[PDB]
Amino acid sequence: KTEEGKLVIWINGDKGYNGLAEVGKKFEKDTGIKVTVEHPDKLEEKFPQVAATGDGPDIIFWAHDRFGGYAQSGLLAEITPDKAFQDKLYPFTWDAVRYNGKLIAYPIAVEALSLIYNKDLLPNPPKTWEEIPALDKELKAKGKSALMFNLQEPYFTWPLIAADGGYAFKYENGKYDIKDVGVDNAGAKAGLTFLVDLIKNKHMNADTDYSIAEAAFNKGETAMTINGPWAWSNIDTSKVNYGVTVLPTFKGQPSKPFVGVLSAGINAASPNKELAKEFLENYLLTDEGLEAVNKDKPLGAVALKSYEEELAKDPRIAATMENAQKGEIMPNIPQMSAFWYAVRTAVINAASGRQTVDEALKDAQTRITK
């Protein structure tokens, strides 16, 4: 079991694990509060199991989507931000930390799958999706690919389909309708046909993934590639000039990429609402803490409006915020789980040629709103 007069921050061994430790060494010097950081494995289910008693850690960090899993059952602590706390953060970001109007979190850092390309062979990046296909024919002539990604998750092919006009839930009346899915839409039906015809015309590869796509960029094969916030960590010794740019457009329409924010969590038992709220307010959501963790592990964009500028100094970061602003945040409802499964077989069933485009979206629609 944990004790008082201390702070235990849990990390996924890949997100400011060493940088966060620095902030702790300062806290103790300012007051004397202990600050430990651990990165266990499979702590997803092991976290809420012990959290119920309050013996495990105290503070947790996860996406807004998952943040709505421990509170739904009643295994999280509430909150009470001030005008400066609610003003510093963005309105939309707050929507991610809310179940039924009640607030049980406070977003700090924001992340999202942006476009990472190299300025070695391709100086000018493709602003439109229709411009990539042509490159696939040229870049291939030399003996290299143009752009790849993870073909094992509809989420990766969302900005291409959802962009044309497709969603999972309908945001209305304050909440998101569960009996209203946007899969078999006029736009979505055509969106998929794009990626589909590609693999059919030998424009892409079937054996494509985030890993295989990550190495192709490191070795210097593909000019462009899409990866998460855990890509910058890879580069350090090779020193590869990376470029962050918002996802292209389709038919003159904005992309509909997902949103991935990073908020802090607190237990209802008795972790440290006084120290945690103070450490996260004046030692995490400020240049003193953010810059400290960013120096070792720059998460990228954040919710803090003030820090949004200092970070916006370079378009590389400006593109991150634009991805979340134009993108769409995932609701905090349990129905979202069913969507992860339905959509999974949907895209796969289409690519494999087991079900038509309209059929894949039709069946999935019934599965989600079943």
DSSP annotation string for 247-266: --BBTTB----EEEEEEEEE
Nearest to 92 by CA among 303, 276, 367, 235: 303
Residues β-bridged to residue 61:
264
Q: What separation, in Å, do the N-terminal and C-terminal C-alpha atoms of the chain show?
A: 42
H helix or E strand, kind and range, residue 117: strand 114-118
Pairing state between β 328-329 and 258-266? parallel
Question: What was the elucidation method?
Answer: NMR
Number of H helices, E strands in the chain: 15, 13
Separation of alpha carbons 186 and 296, rounded Å: 46
Q: Which residues contact 346 (CB under 8 A, 6 or more apart)?
A: 154, 183, 360, 361, 363, 364
Asked if residue 232 lies in contact with residue 113, where contact means CB atoms within 8 angstroms, the answer is no
Q: Which residues contact 264 (CB under 8 A, 6 or more apart)?
A: 59, 60, 61, 105, 106, 108, 276, 280, 284
Separation of alpha carbons 92 and 247, rounded Å: 20
Asked if residue 213 lies in contact with residue 156, where contact means CB atoms within 8 angstroms, the answer is no
Tell the residue number behind the tokens 């012990």, with chain if given.
50
Question: CB neighbours (10 Å) of residue 270?
Answer: 11
The residue extents of the domains of the chain are 5-111+260-331, 112-259+332-370
Give me the torsion for CA of 122, 123, 124, 126, rounded to 10°. Answer: 30
> What type of residue sits at position 355?
Q
Q: Work out the angle at residue 228's Cα, subtended by the Cα atoms of residues 41 and 267, and round it to the nearest 5 degrees.
A: 45
Q: Work out the angle at residue 92's Cα, subtended by the Cα atoms of residues 89 and 93, and round it to the nearest 5 degrees.
A: 50
Kindly report the CATH number that applies to the domain delimited by 112-259+332-370: 3.40.190.10
Fold matches, 5-111+260-331 and 112-259+332-370: yes
Nearest to 309 by CA among 283, 297, 291: 291
Question: CB neighbours (10 Å) of residue 63?
Answer: 17
Tell the residue number behind the tokens 């400290």, with chain if given.
292
Separation of alpha carbons 56 and 44, rounded Å: 12
Q: Which residues contact 134 (CB under 8 A, 6 or more apart)?
A: none
Separation of alpha carbons 15 and 275, rounded Å: 22
Separation of alpha carbons 193 and 158, rounded Å: 13
Tell the residue number behind the tokens 């494995």, with chain if given.
41
Kindly report the CATH number that applies to the domain delimited by 5-111+260-331: 3.40.190.10
Residues β-bridged to residue 111:
260
**Torsion sign across C-alpha atoms 36, 39, 40, 43:** positive
DSSP SS3 for 209:
coil
Residues β-bridged to residue 253:
250
Asked if residue 51 lies in contact with residue 8, where contact means CB atoms within 8 angstroms, the answer is no
For 175-196, b/e burial (b = at least 16 CB within 10 A) is bbebeebbbbbebbbbbbebbb
Cα atoms in the Cβ-side hemisphere of radius 13 Å centred on 180: 8
Separation of alpha carbons 355 and 347, rounded Å: 9
**Torsion sign across C-alpha atoms 148, 149, 154, 159:** negative
Asked if residue 181 lies in contact with residue 156, where contact means CB atoms within 8 angstroms, the answer is no
**Torsion sign across C-alpha atoms 298, 302, 307, 309:** positive
